[PDB]
Design a protein around this ligand. Structure first.
Ligand code: CLA
Ligand code: CLA
Ligand code: CLA
Ligand code: CLA
Ligand code: CLA
Ligand code: CLA
Ligand code: CLA
Ligand code: CLA
Ligand SMILES: CCCCCCCCCCCCCCCC(=O)OC[C@H](COP(=O)(O)OC[C@@H](O)CO)OC(=O)CCCCCCCCCCCCCCC
Ligand SMILES: CC1=C(C/C=C(\C)CCC[C@H](C)CCC[C@H](C)CCCC(C)C)C(=O)c2ccccc2C1=O
Ligand code: SF4
Ligand code: SF4
Ligand code: SF4
Lengths: 132, 80, 73, 162, 63, 73, 742, 73
């Protein structure tokens, strides 16, 4: 279910079949023209749409344009060369901008920023001042 | 990968999460500020390092912070 | 011989200005109060809060190089 | 004299400069008729030039072997007109501007919109302030030994370092 | 501590307004908030922000 | 002419390298608690004075030395 | 009827209220200043009318009235010049002997010893030598008196006030609607037939009746005084038939279709006037007549209110091939709903035109007594090369402003625009190669010559004595133009220019024109020209094609036209915006045009310009050093830049000493630019904080907080000083060099 | 070149070169083992600095030695 497009030279490279490639799925109620992140234009097909891209940003940039410009909503996948797929956006079905009970704290310092140690204190260690 | 740390001066106004172009940050439950929510950096390996999150943070000084780290193909931002 | 000496003086003061400012603001400034956390050499702090090109203490050295070459010249 | 310099009225090379500067304008004057505008302009230029050499001769300046006037800034009082007297003059006008400009910023500071009065000058107020800097060495001295010239150390923001 | 409308001095070192004065607007009575005090300022910082949250031990009162 | 300009250009690199390593010291070697109120710590405590005054001298030499040359031209 | 007039009455009230509120035009700046950045934003955004309102009608009204203001400043400029020519010039003394009297229309006041700038020019007059060619242009019009220049100056002031009034009238009183502006077919018919067609007809009318007979008497040797008033040429046919004996027929051979009776004034002789060294006025009168018939006929190609004619829309939409897909569909909405897309064409055309104009005025000199004034020839040529250079890149800037703001994907499915964006990696990578191919070859020819010569091996250099690189294609074309009079153009008496070969024209002992032979030193330089244009196009083209997105930044169009970067991740994002592509390409245009004017100034001085004596002994200005001194960089550095500098550096104490001061002044400004271009903002803002402290310590600080110049702005400052200092240093070097050899 | 023109101009250019090399027959048999990328922000300053420096010193050495030895007085 790929959208209507005449092709372009700004698509995927070897990295796709050798390193991870990304696909994005969305559902549209009607046929409308949208801008390609690597290409100028394309007509989306009513029903489910499937697009393959080369970067997570390119996929997420299309989502942003699909969101506040068309009122529609999508899923990102990471595809490996062997065939294993990963589910990325949204992580738990709920968007990262909205709090969801069940999420946890990652990478949080429990103090303000002026409270980091001097670099001379962590001398000859394999760390850094912001990892204490 | 890059390192993104989140300090306690975070007032939980979700503006860093809305600015991230590669889905690195998210909002989680927290009981230390009015909004009862703090930013979190669960996927720092998609972090490209563009610092859009810090341009969006209203606190002084910043609550979110990006530190340069070893570069992979993902943080280099390569399409090849 | 009097005018050239004051030019040579100007060269020494500006070169010193860039090197002394780079050493004293190496640990932090108003625009970046946690500079010591990023080390001696780094690109910048992004285009946030105005923009921050050439903020590292390494950048002061790079800017001073032009003055040494100019005041020895 | 000082540095082996000679006064300009007694310098053989300063006198040669005067002659050659006049000769150059006379050889340009000969190509014009006597009543016309280019002949009256060059005649006025040679008067201005001749008065420039006469002025220096009695000036009391020092010349070198190059024939040009030199200036002495050791602090000798005999060569005061060269640096001291125009120096005291500049200090009076430069310190007048800095004092008056500072009075303005301090005046419009206590206000709703101080920034509005820096792009759009309150001229009646500014005009008043500009002429109050005629006695600045007395006004800058009253505020030094009052406490209103320099602020305290706990009022200036400082970089994280110190 | 301060009240609403009190004029304080910032004692945070990495703040833009360290050693600078400004006016308390709201103090959160709930002590679970770590930085309960909204303090407003008339001059902006480098990000053109006019206010910030502080703790009670980071502000001094002027009179 | 080769000798005098050889040692003056090398003197410039050495001088610039001294301040460059002086900055590196502050970033990853200076310990603030070890030099409380020290002669070294006090230099950071009035760093704005040194910089602002070095800036004045430079502006003064630049304005007058450049202005005098242009007046003569 | 589809073409009508729609005007809104009393649209905007005229009051001094907004004058007292700077920044009223935009939503963010109207709050007032908080930092000093506000002052800079005030100016950068003042003419950006697109970002002030959302209505296309309100943008169009602002543009229309601003055109009246631009023209009113041009009329004031023209009225000044004529005024200076009437009260501060030596026009009369020049008219009597235009071979010995130098030109001048400026006089300086004597106040600080600066009177020395009034040169001894001649005719009992002292002033600054001007090189604009006002004098030569006045002679060709048949001026001859200062009274006539005074009327042009009064008429220029009246026209200037009429423009000022029209711009105020059309913005406040009679503001025309959006429907009026969107009439392309009407507008084209009026500009072709009315502005260009009637302009050439009336001008031709002035040339036949006033300019032709006065020039004939000036050329024969009649003093200006004995020449009658211009209006007397309009009344007595007796005076007109003595000079051109076909006025006895009157106007009857025009309506009988016997136009060959007028071969007295409608010539096709070619060449130049042996007396003045300019083009034959009789050829120029025929030139404007043939133009004006062409322009008036061309202004009937579009359909307005009567059925007949072409609609621009059905033309473009018919052009579609099997490689182009939809072809030109959509280019109407584009070019009738966006002002940026229009300038992108227009500035590219007008800039190309000014380059074209400069190439045709040195080879076929149209004014009399101008070809031997080498200061005017050199000044006028470079000027149009610079104005052409800036306008060309300015077209590429608006092409990229269009892609960011006015471009929409839904309006362009599968058309030529959509398709270029689809293979944009292929246009850029192929161009990239052509650039690496042209640079290694054209510039490597010079390196080879530099090392071969230094190693003592001149037998192996690319030269006219070693391995020749003869430009055989351009030499072949020259022969065609030389043999053209009689054969290909059977009614032409002489060649269009004497550059293609022919005879040597001389006025007053100086050479006006000569054949310009092309050898291998020519050939090598033409590739440098090729090469620097291809690189300039590589930066500007890339900026337009990647204005909306790239593999690096997929959402570049959301960031805008001019942003500094997208941060220090993804490696380096500095200068990714399409504004920064315009910024880089400005340095190339500079590089390209500098080599053009260097090539022109040296080739003319080596192989054309000079004096002569008995038996045609030509002595050139630099003595023919062009074939064996420009093939190496050392030769360009030592014989062009070092040798010809002697004037500007030894100009002190003379009347051209202002050129020596501006020479140094522009070397200073150029170096001053490098402080802005090599550094960046966060070193400067920390520097300001220590300065602000010294003010705070003394109880005072400005309430408008001092902030360093922004990233984008610090680049635009360094570029403006780089151009000013660079172009200026050359300006001073060119005039003091050419005034001494003219 | 390294001091005025910055990085994200160059990064975008190389992406078209990586594309071209991957699409041309007979050049497709060869391939890099390290992804070609544009020099970084701090690397461009150091390189641009080394050129400005080495060019600065070599052209003065050239001048001062031969102007003295070519005139010998
Ligand atoms: C370029 C060089 C330059 C120079 C030479 C000056 C010179 C001057 N500036 Mg300006 N200025 C400059 C550049 C310069 N400026 C620049 C770049 C700026 C930044 C934009 C300014 C900004 C500026 C401001 C805002 C002001 C000046 C003012 C002044 C004047 C202060 C001294 C004075 O008023 O007279 C000397 C006056 C006296 C000595 C009077 C003495 C006092 C009285 C009471 C004694 C009376 C004696 C009596 C009358 C004698 C008669 C006795 C009889 C028997 C003979 C002075 C004329 C001030 C001014 O214009 O004054 C209103 C002022 O407000 N300047
Ligand atoms: C010729 C080129 C040039 C010039 C003129 C300057 C000028 C300056 N640079 Mg520099 N800079 C340059 C190249 C140059 N730069 C390059 C290539 C680099 C490498 C990127 C730098 C990097 C750099 C840095 C890092 C620093 C400087 C600093 C300075 C300032 C030194 C203080 C001074 O001299 O005051 C005199 C001012 C001038 C000479 C500017 C010209 C002013 C003219 C108009 C005055 C005219 C004379 C007279 C006063 C006329 C009277 C005025 C009238 C109204 C009465 C000054 C603004 C330092 C600084 O800003 O400290 C204050 C500083 O930290 N620059
Ligand atoms: C625009 C083209 C142009 C240019 C570049 C010149 C240039 C020149 N003219 Mg000229 N002139 C022109 C057009 C031009 N003119 C026209 C159209 C006329 C006929 C009206 C004249 C009539 C004329 C005469 C009669 C003379 C000149 C002279 C001169 C020279 C000295 C001018 C001078 O220093 O006055 C100095 C001017 C001032 C000090 C006025 C100060 C202006 C400031 C205050 C700007 C004010 C703007 C203000 C802030 C805006 C507020 C807006 C609000 C009021 C609404 C100079 C080379 C003189 C000359 O050549 O001597 C031999 C001379 O005698 N001109
Ligand atoms: C005895 C003197 C001495 C010593 C021991 C050091 C030692 C050190 N310095 Mg140092 N430095 C010195 C003098 C010294 N420097 C001087 C004189 C300067 C002024 C120029 C500097 C400026 C300086 C800076 C700015 C930095 C150091 C750094 C360092 C550290 C790592 C160096 C490194 O990785 O190099 C790696 C080696 C190279 C990159 C090779 C570079 C070769 C250069 C580019 C020249 C090559 C050009 C070539 C000659 C051109 C040929 C021309 C031909 C075609 C004609 C190390 C502790 C760095 C650091 O990380 O410290 C924490 C750092 O940032 N130093
Ligand atoms: C025959 C009719 C005619 C003529 C001569 C023009 C001429 C012009 N138009 Mg125009 N226009 C026309 C019809 C015409 N238009 C119509 C019908 C429309 C609506 C579709 C427009 C819409 C339009 C727009 C939207 C714009 C123009 C602009 C311009 C100017 C282009 C700039 C230039 O080359 O300056 C050359 C300048 C001159 C030759 C000086 C002439 C000055 C006045 C106008 C004299 C002309 C009046 C009259 C014919 C003279 C009679 C001579 C007398 C001896 C008999 C130019 C003055 C642009 C401009 O600058 O606007 C101000 C612009 O933005 N036109
Ligand atoms: C567009 C500008 C223009 C203008 C205003 C004039 C104006 C004039 N021309 Mg004319 N003319 C023009 C262009 C122009 N011409 C061109 C372009 C050519 C060459 C193709 C001529 C060739 C020409 C000749 C050969 C003669 C005139 C004559 C005249 C005069 C009387 C014509 C008359 O009353 O006929 C009546 C008006 C109409 C029928 C309308 C009049 C001054 C005559 C003249 O000089 O008389 C003294 C005359 O014999 N013209
Ligand atoms: C017919 C010509 C034309 C027109 C109408 C425009 C119109 C516009 N351009 Mg544009 N442009 C042009 C030609 C033109 N340009 C050319 C030739 C170039 C290439 C150089 C550009 C490059 C360009 C860029 C790169 C940008 C624009 C922008 C803009 C827009 C806002 C401009 C503004 O507010 O500036 C206000 C005007 C000024 C601030 C004046 C400053 C001009 C310089 C610095 C001074 C000139 C020096 C002086 C001549 C000599 C000094 C001597 C010294 C001794 C004093 C506006 C739509 C900007 C935009 O946002 O687009 C929407 C933008 O980013 N243009
Ligand atoms: C003298 C200074 C200089 C030089 C040599 C260059 C060189 C180049 N620039 Mg430029 N650039 C400069 C200043 C300079 N720049 C400045 C000041 C700026 C700031 C505005 C820029 C901004 C800039 C941009 C923005 C762009 C360039 C581009 C280019 C490239 C043009 C392609 C080409 O022909 O390369 C060929 C190399 C040469 C012409 C120089 C050397 C020729 C050699 C001698 C012949 C072949 C040698 C051989 C390959 C190796 C053998 C020698 C070795 C074994 C020792 C080239 C690498 C463009 C580019 O990459 O497009 C392709 C481009 O887009 N530059
Ligand atoms: C030059 C070649 C040329 O003129 O071909 C002309 C060729 C004609 O294409 P079409 O017949 O599809 O064009 C029909 C309409 O677009 C005409 O307006 O244009 C191309 O195919 C573009 C190919 C790019 C050429 C690569 C360089
Ligand atoms: C010097 C410099 C500054 C400092 C320059 C500033 C702060 C602008 C100062 C402009 C003044 C305030 C305008 C008035 C000009 C002078 C007061 C008068 C000089 C004109 C003479 C002819 C008198 C930057 O902010 C900057 C930012 C980004 C990249 C490079 C640089 C940079 O190189
Ligand atoms: S550095 Fe950039 S990509 Fe990473 S979290 Fe911040 S905004 Fe997102
Ligand atoms: S880090 Fe900043 S943007 Fe993110 S939630 Fe906290 S205050 Fe908001
Ligand atoms: S533009 Fe400045 S702040 Fe942004 S990435 Fe480049 S150097 Fe860093």
């Amino acid at each position: 279910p790929s959208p209507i497009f005449g092709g372009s030279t700004g698509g995927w490279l070897r990295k796709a079949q050798v390193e991870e490639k990304y696909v994005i799925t969305w559902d549209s109620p009607k046929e409308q023209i949208f801008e390609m992140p690597t290409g100028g234009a394309a007509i989306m097909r009513e029903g489910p749409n499937l697009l393959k891209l080369a970067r997570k940003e390119q996929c997420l940039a299309l989502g942003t344009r699909l969101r506040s410009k068309y009122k529609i909503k999508y899923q990102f996948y990471r595809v490996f060369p062997n065939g294993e797929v990963q589910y990325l956006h949204p992580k738990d079905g709920v968007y990262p901008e909205k709090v969801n009970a069940g999420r946890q704290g990652v990478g949080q310092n429990f103090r303000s920023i002026g409270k980091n140690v001097s670099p001379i204190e962590v001398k000859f260690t394999g760390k850094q001042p912001y990892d204490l | 990968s890059h390192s993104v740390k989140i300090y306690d001066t975070c007032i939980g106004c979700t503006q860093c999460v809305r600015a991230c172009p590669t889905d690195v940050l998210e909002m989680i439950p927290w009981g230390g500020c009015k909004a009862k929510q703090i930013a979190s950096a669960p996927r720092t390996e998609d972090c490209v390092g563009c610092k859009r999150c810090e341009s969006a943070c209203p606190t002084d000084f910043l609550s979110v912070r990006v530190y340069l780290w070893h570069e992979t193909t993902r943080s280099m931002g390569l399409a090849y | 011989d009097f005018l050239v000496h004051h030019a040579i003086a100007l060269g020494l003061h500006v070169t010193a200005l860039i090197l002394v400012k780079g050493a004293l603001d190496a640990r932090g400034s108003k625009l970046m109060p946690d500079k010591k956390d990023f080390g001696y050499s780094f690109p910048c702090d992004g285009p946030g809060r105005g923009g921050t090109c050439d903020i590292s203490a390494w950048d002061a050295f790079y800017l001073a190089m032009f003055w040494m070459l100019n005041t020895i010249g | 004299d000082i540095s082996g310099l000679t006064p300009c009225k007694e310098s053989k090379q300063f006198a040669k400069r005067e002659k050659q500067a006049l000769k150059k304008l006379q050889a340009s004057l000969k190509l014009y008729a006597d009543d016309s505008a280019p002949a009256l302009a060059i005649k006025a230029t040679m008067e201005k030039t001749k008065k420039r050499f006469d002025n220096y001769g009695k000036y009391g300046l020092l010349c070198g072997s190059d024939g040009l006037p030199h200036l002495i800034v050791s602090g000798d009082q005999r060569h005061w007109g060269e640096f001291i007297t125009p120096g005291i003059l500049f200090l009076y006008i430069a310190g007048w501007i800095g004092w008056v400009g500072r009075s303005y910023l301090i005046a419009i500071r206590d206000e709703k919109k101080p920034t509005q009065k820096e792009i759009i000058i309150d001229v009646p107020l500014a005009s008043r302030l500009l002429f109050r800097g005629f006695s600045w060495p007395v006004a800058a001295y009253r505020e030094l030994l009052n406490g209103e010239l320099v602020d305290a150390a706990a009022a200036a923001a400082a970089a994280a370092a110190a | 501590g301060p009240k609403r409308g009190a004029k304080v001095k910032i004692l945070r070192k990495e703040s833009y307004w360290y050693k600078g004065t400004g006016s308390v607007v709201a103090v959160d009575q709930d002590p679970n908030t770590r930085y309960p005090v909204v303090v407003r300022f008339n001059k902006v910082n480098y990000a053109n922000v006019s206010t910030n949250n502080y703790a009670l031990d980071e502000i001094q009162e002027v009179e | 002419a080769a000798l005098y300009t050889h040692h003056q250009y090398i003197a410039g690199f050495l001088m610039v390298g001294a301040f460059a390593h002086g900055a590196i010291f502050f970033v990853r070697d200076y310990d603030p608690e070890l030099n409380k109120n020290n002669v070294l710590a006090r230099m950071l405590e009035h760093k704005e004075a040194i910089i602002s005054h070095l800036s004045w001298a430079s502006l003064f030499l630049g304005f007058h030395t450049l202005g005098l040359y242009i007046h003569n031209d | 009827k589809n073409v009508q007039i729609f005007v809104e009455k009393d649209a905007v009230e005229t009051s001094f209220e907004k004058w007292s509120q700077p920044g009223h035009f935009s939503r963010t700046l109207a709050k007032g200043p908080k930092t000093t950045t506000w002052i800079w934003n005030l100016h950068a955004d003042a003419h950006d009318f697109d970002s002030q309102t959302n209505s296309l009608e309100e943008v169009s009204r602002k543009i229309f009235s601003a055109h009246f203001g631009q023209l009113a400043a041009i009329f004031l400029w023209i009225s000044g010049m004529h005024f200076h020519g009437a009260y501060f010039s030596n026009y009369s003394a020049w008219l009597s002997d235009p071979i010995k009297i130098k030109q001048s229309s400026q006089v300086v006041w004597p106040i600080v010893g600066q009177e020395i700038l009034n040169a001894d020019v001649g005719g009992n007059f002292q002033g600054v030598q001007t090189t604009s060619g006002w004098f030569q242009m006045w002679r060709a019009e048949g001026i001859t008196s200062e009274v006539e220049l005074y009327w042009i100056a009064i008429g220029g002031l009246i026209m200037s006030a009429l423009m000022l009034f029209a711009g105020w009238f059309h913005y406040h009183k009679a503001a025309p609607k959006l429907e009026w502006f969107q009439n392309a077919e009407s507008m084209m018919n009026h500009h072709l037939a009315g502005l260009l067609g009637l302009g050439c007809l009336s001008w031709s009318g002035h040339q036949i009746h006033i300019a032709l007979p006065i020039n004939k008497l000036l050329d024969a040797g009649v003093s200006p005084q004995e020449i009658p008033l211009p209006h007397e040429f309009l009344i007595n046919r007796d005076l007109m038939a003595q000079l051109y004996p076909s006025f006895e027929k009157g106007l009857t051979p025009f309506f009988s279709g016997q136009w060959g009776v007028y071969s007295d004034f409608l010539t096709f002789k070619g060449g130049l006037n042996p007396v003045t060294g300019g083009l034959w006025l009789s050829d120029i009168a025929h030139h404007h007549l043939a133009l004006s018939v062409l322009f008036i006929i061309a202004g009937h190609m579009y359909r307005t209110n009567w059925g007949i004619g072409h609609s621009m829309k059905e033309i473009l939409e018919a052009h579609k091939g099997p490689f182009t897909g939809e072809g030109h569909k959509g280019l109407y909405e584009i070019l009738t709903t966006s002002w940026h897309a229009q300038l992108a064409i227009n500035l590219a055309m007008i800039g190309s035109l000014s380059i074209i104009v400069a190439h045709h005025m040195y080879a076929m000199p149209p004014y009399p007594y101008i070809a031997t004034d080498y200061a005017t020839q050199l000044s006028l040529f470079t000027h149009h090369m610079w104005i052409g250079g800036f306008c060309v890149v300015g077209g590429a800037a608006h092409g990229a402003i269009f892609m960011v703001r006015d471009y929409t994907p839904a309006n362009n499915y599968n058309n030529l625009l959509d398709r270029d964006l689809r293979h944009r990696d292929e246009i850029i990578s192929n161009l990239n190669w052509v650039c690496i191919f042209l640079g290694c070859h054209a510039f490597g020819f010079y390196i080879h010559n530099d090392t071969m010569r230094a190693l003592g091996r001149p037998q192996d250099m690319f030269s006219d004595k070693a391995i020749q690189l003869q430009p055989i294609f351009a030499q072949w074309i020259q022969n065609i133009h030389l043999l053209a009079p009689g054969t290909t153009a059977p009614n032409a008496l002489a060649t269009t220019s004497y550059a293609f070969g022919g005879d040597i024209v001389e006025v007053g002992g100086k050479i006006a024109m000569m054949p310009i032979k092309l050898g291998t030193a020519d050939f090598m330089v033409h590739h440098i020209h090729a090469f620097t244009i291809h690189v300039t196009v590589l930066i500007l083209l890339k900026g337009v094609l990647y204005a909306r997105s790239s593999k690096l930044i997929p959402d570049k169009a959301n960031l805008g036209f001019r942003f500094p970067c997208d941060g220090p991740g993804r490696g380096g994002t500095c200068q990714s915006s399409s504004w920064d592509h315009v910024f880089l390409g400005l340095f190339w245009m500079y590089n390209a045009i500098s080599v053009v004017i260097f090539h022109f100034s040296w080739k003319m001085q080596s192989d054309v310009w000079g004096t002569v004596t008995a038996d045609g002994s030509i002595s050139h200005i630099t003595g023919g050093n062009f074939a064996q001194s420009s093939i190496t960089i050392n030769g360009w550095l030592r014989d062009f830049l070092w040798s010809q500098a002697s004037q500007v550096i030894q100009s002190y104490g003379s009347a051209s000493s202002a050129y020596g001061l501006i020479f140094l002044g522009a070397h200073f400004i150029w170096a001053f630019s490098l402080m802005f271009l090599f550094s960046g903002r966060g070193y400067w803002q920390e520097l300001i904080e220590s300065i602000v402290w010294a003010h705070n310590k003394l109880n005072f600080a400005p309430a408008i907080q001092p902030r360093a110049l922004s990233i984008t702005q610090g680049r635009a400052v360094g570029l403006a000083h780089y151009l000013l200092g660079g172009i200026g240093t050359t300006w001073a070097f060119f005039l003091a060099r050419s005034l001494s050899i003219t | 070149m390294f001091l005025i023109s910055w990085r994200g101009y160059w990064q975008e250019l190389i992406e078209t070169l990586v594309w071209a090399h991957e699409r041309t027959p007979l050049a497709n048999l060869i391939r890099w083992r390290d992804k070609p990328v544009a020099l970084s922000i701090v690397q461009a300053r150091l390189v641009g600095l080394v050129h400005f420096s080495v060019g600065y010193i070599l052209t003065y050495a050239a001048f001062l030695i031969a102007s003295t030895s070519g005139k010998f007085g």
